[PDB]
């Protein structure tokens, strides 16, 4: 559960991400693939080389989605339903991988927002990625 504070911290930091988000998505991706090489098992149809149109377009769809979750942190389930359906019924990405991406997402954030990334925002984004992960995985079985 994201308390009000958490919600505050997320929208705040997400905001600062602003129009960088997409390229944020694309670096988090590249960071997962290089750090957690097993995650590439879900992307054999992708040119996974640095600066791929694919990864960038993908990092972009990812971010959009997060911007949506943030825009709707009080109704993540319906906000993300379409995507929880596709994740459970089409991509079927094992749930351990959500956590790996949450991680590289934190890393991306930390490194792009030297001011906003305090212990309490860190905490909050963590709880929040953990929450997104859950919505998306909720319909797995």
């Amino acid at each position: 559960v994201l308390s009000p504070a958490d919600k505050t911290n997320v929208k705040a930091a997400w905001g600062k991400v602003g129009a960088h988000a997409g390229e944020y998505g694309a670096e988090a991706l590249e960071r997962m693939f290089l750090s957690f090489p097993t995650t590439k098992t879900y992307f054999p149809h992708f040119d996974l080389s640095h600066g791929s149109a694919q990864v960038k377009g993908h990092g972009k769809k990812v971010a959009d989605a997060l911007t949506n979750a943030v825009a709707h942190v009080d109704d993540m389930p319906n906000a993300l339903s379409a995507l929880s359906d596709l994740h459970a019924h089409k991509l079927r990405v094992d749930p351990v991988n959500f956590k790996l991406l949450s991680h590289c997402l934190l890393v991306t954030l930390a490194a792009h927002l030297p001011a906003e990334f305090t212990p309490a925002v860190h905490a909050s984004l963590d709880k929040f990625l953990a929450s997104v992960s859950t919505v998306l995985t909720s319909k797995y079985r």
Partner: protein, 145 residues
């Protein structure tokens, strides 16, 4: 990675295992308990229900190969990596199987074992078997890149 007593405990119990029967149960159970693993077997046919799954011919067939291969490693419990090197590589390079699955399998397996052996699959034998599966999962993931 197993002590003298755990090796004895694993071997003994594997003696009583019809690899084919266990193989189909485990593979079938994976698919029922963690439906997302169905992602690698879209050819296998109907996986719509526990039933369809469980009785599907390809599940059983496939399950047999797997555990046949699992059985081969039991033999080389001291070269667990060396042994699965070719398989590690194929699951990566061609199958694109997230190594996580090997872990779901080992657990489902332990479950199958226990179900089948009841009171014989004791805390200590399970312990020995938790090590083996883990060892197997790691051996198969070893060439992932």
């Amino acid at each position: 990675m197993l002590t003298p007593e755990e090796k004895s405990a694993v071997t003994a119990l594997w003696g009583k295992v019809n690899v084919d029967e266990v193989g189909g149960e485990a593979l079938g159970r994976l698919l029922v308990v963690y439906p997302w693993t169905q992602r690698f077997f879209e050819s296998f046919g109907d996986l719509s229900t526990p039933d369809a799954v469980m009785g599907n011919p390809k599940v059983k067939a496939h399950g047999k190969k797997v555990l046949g291969a699992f059985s081969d490693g039991l033999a080389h419990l001291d070269n667990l990596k060396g042994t699965f090197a070719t398989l590690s590589e194929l699951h990566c390079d061609k199958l694109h199987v997230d190594p996580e699955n090997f872990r779901l399998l080992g657990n489902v397996l332990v479950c199958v074992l226990a179900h089948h052996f009841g009171k014989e699959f004791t805390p200590p034998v399970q312990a020995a078997y938790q090590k083996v599966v883990a060892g197997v999962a790691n051996a198969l993931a070893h060439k992932y890149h």
